[PDB]
Amino acid sequence: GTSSAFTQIDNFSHFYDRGDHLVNGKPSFTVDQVADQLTRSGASWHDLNNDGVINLTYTFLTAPPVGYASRGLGTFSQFSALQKEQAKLSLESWADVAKVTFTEGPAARGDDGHMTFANFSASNGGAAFAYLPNSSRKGESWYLINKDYQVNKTPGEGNYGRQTLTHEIGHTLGLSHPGDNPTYRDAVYAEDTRAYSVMSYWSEKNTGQVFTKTGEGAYASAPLLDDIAAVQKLYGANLETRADDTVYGFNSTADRDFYSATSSTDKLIFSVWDGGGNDTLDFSGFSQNQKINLTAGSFSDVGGMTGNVSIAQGVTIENAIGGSGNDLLIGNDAANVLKGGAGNDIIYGGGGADVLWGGTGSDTFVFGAVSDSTPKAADIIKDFQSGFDKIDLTAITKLGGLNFVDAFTGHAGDAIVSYHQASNAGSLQVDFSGQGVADFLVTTVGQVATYDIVA
């Protein structure tokens, strides 16, 4: 029997689990399983000049290629500057995660391949299409534009015009669509929605995520969690990308339109890829109840939306800052700095010595294991407010309570609450194993009382 606060943390940390179960009658695939699914055609570019990176060049077509007329595409036109600008941003977002480089220029001798972008006008061509890297027309992608279909004319962060570019380019890199009029009912796995992969034809609503409301459209601009794993499986991860301390979200330093927020109404949808350093997910500008998880491969509910933000497999984000709402913050095994913000927050540091800030409001610092805060690597609550904040240990004690004493007696369950009214430093020591010495330590900036502990 643990507290309600712990249940909420545990519940959310498992809310998006994948693999070995059925979801909507369909098998749930893990990220790894999906990466095999998205690259099942076996097609990809080869490294001809041997140097561990695929060097592709691309051209914005100026004139129709030889035999163009026979394609049935109608009037040929070239990319406008807007499209070229957006195309470069999408290409960039792929280069960021996998070892693939893209350079604007004519087909050269030392390239591994060449790509072309162009527009057509005959709707019978479809909204847009690309070719796999093992076909005669490899590297080509085409975009419909006419009076009746206008989405490719104004692509921009967040709209389908931008996702199309990202989607089609993914296809030219070798990624297949999640499955082979069809609907989500025909998908092979459960996570085949736009919430996990930009290659999917189905909306996030099929998997329960909530990004927007009828009338408005919100689309991920860059590769999502499954896309990232599928492309790195193909070309290897790019560990040089943002390998220095990076901030995502508000006050962002990632220099990418899709990782950037400047307003409380912003609708973020992204998957973090990062090379290393001490990193932060800053969601301070939002006022909605958020739920942030710093676990690699996990999802978070940000800025009033659900399952819209995730962290790629093999990535470690160190810090997270909540917003004005009553948030849940979950750390990982690294030393995390977690700031709650205003509102009533539930913070779970995890393993390692964590720096925790509750901010204003009545906050709860939850602990699920003795190994979460030991004397060697002890947590520190920089702003504990006695009489308002609580230190929840129920997941450990299971509500058996603690025995507050002045000195350890050797009986398991003994706890000592100290305070140095000069440094304003307080601490909680506990002997869970009853080995006569403290095996759990939690220090704080601010006096802690015995009634501020929930055990």
Annotated binding residues for Ca(2+), written as ranges, equal 47, 49, 51, 53, 55, 112, 242, 244, 246, 274, 276-277, 279, 316, 318, 323, 325, 327, 332, 334, 336, 340-343, 345, 349-352, 354, 358-361, 363, 372, 379, 389
Q: Of 162, 242, 256, 339, which one interacts with Ca ion (CB under 5 A)?
A: 242
Q: Does 113 bind Ca ion (CB under 5 A)?
A: no
Tell me: does residue 354 bind Ca ion (CB under 5 A).
Answer: yes
**Among the candidate windows 51-59, 97-105, 157-165, 398-406, which touches Ca ion by CB under 5 A?**
51-59
User: Does 359 contact Ca ion by CB under 5 A?
Assistant: yes
- If binding is defined by CB under 5 A, does position 240 make contact with Ca ion? no
Residues β-bridged to residue 453: 391
Does 352 contact Ca ion by CB under 5 A? yes
CA 164, CA 219: separation in Å to the nearest integer?
10
Whether 168 is catalytic is: yes
Q: Where are the alpha helices (DSSP H) in 74-138?
A: 81-95
Distance CA 185, CA 206 (A): 10
Interaction of residue 392 with Ca ion, rule CB under 5 A: no
**Residue of 51, 85, 186, 240 interacting with Ca ion (CB under 5 A):** 51
Which one of residues 155, 161, 297, 322 is an interface residue with Ca ion (CB under 5 A)? 322
Long-range contacts of 346-349 (CB under 8 A, 24+ apart): 346/5, 346/8, 346/9, 348/9, 348/13, 349/373, 349/379
Provide the b/e sequence for 413-447 (b: ≥16 CB within 10 Å): bbbbbebeeeeebbbbbbbbeeeeebbbbbbbebb
* Residue 327 lies near Ca ion (rule: CB under 5 A): yes
Cβ atoms within 10 A of the Cβ of 373, count? 28
Helices (H), 79-183: 81-95, 160-173
**Segment lying near Ca ion (by CB under 5 A), choices 5-13, 167-175, 357-365, 407-415:** 357-365
Strand ranges (E), 138-276: 140-144, 247-250, 260-261, 270-272
What gap in Å lies between CA 321 and CA 341, rounded to an integer? 7
Q: Which of 85, 157, 168, 240 is catalytic?
A: 168
Among 191, 379, 392, 452, binds Ca ion (CB under 5 A): 379
Task: List, as residue ranges, the binding site for Zn(2+).
Answer: 167-168, 171, 177
Q: Binding-site residues, please? A: 47, 49, 51, 53, 55, 112, 167-168, 171, 177, 242, 244, 246, 274, 276-277, 279, 316, 318, 323, 325, 327, 332, 334, 336, 340-343, 345, 349-352, 354, 358-361, 363, 372, 379, 389
Residue from the set 271, 336, 364, 447 that interacts with Ca ion by CB under 5 A = 336
Helix axes 160-173, 225-235, angle to 10 degrees: 30
Q: Is 282 in the site for Ca ion (CB under 5 A)?
A: no
Q: Is there binding between residue 361 and Ca ion (CB under 5 A)? A: yes
**In contact, 21 and 28? CB cutoff 8 Å:** yes
Residue 316 contacts Ca ion per CB under 5 A: yes
Is 47 one of the binding residues for Ca ion (CB under 5 A)? Answer: yes
Q: Which of 362, 323, 337, 331 is nearest to 349 (CA)?
A: 331
Does residue 285 interact with Ca ion by CB under 5 A?
A: no
Distance CA 189, CA 170 (A): 20
277 scored as a contact of Ca ion (CB under 5 A): yes
Q: Which ranges of 191-309 does DSSP label H, i.e. alpha helix?
A: 225-235
* CB-based contact 444:421 (threshold 8 Å): no
Q: What does DSSP assign to residue 268?
A: -
Q: Which member of 168, 191, 279, 282 binds Ca ion (CB under 5 A)?
A: 279
Binding site for Ca ion (CB under 5 A): 47, 49, 51, 55, 112, 242, 246, 274, 277, 279, 316, 322, 327, 331, 336, 340-341, 343, 345, 349-350, 352, 354, 358-359, 361, 363, 372-373, 379
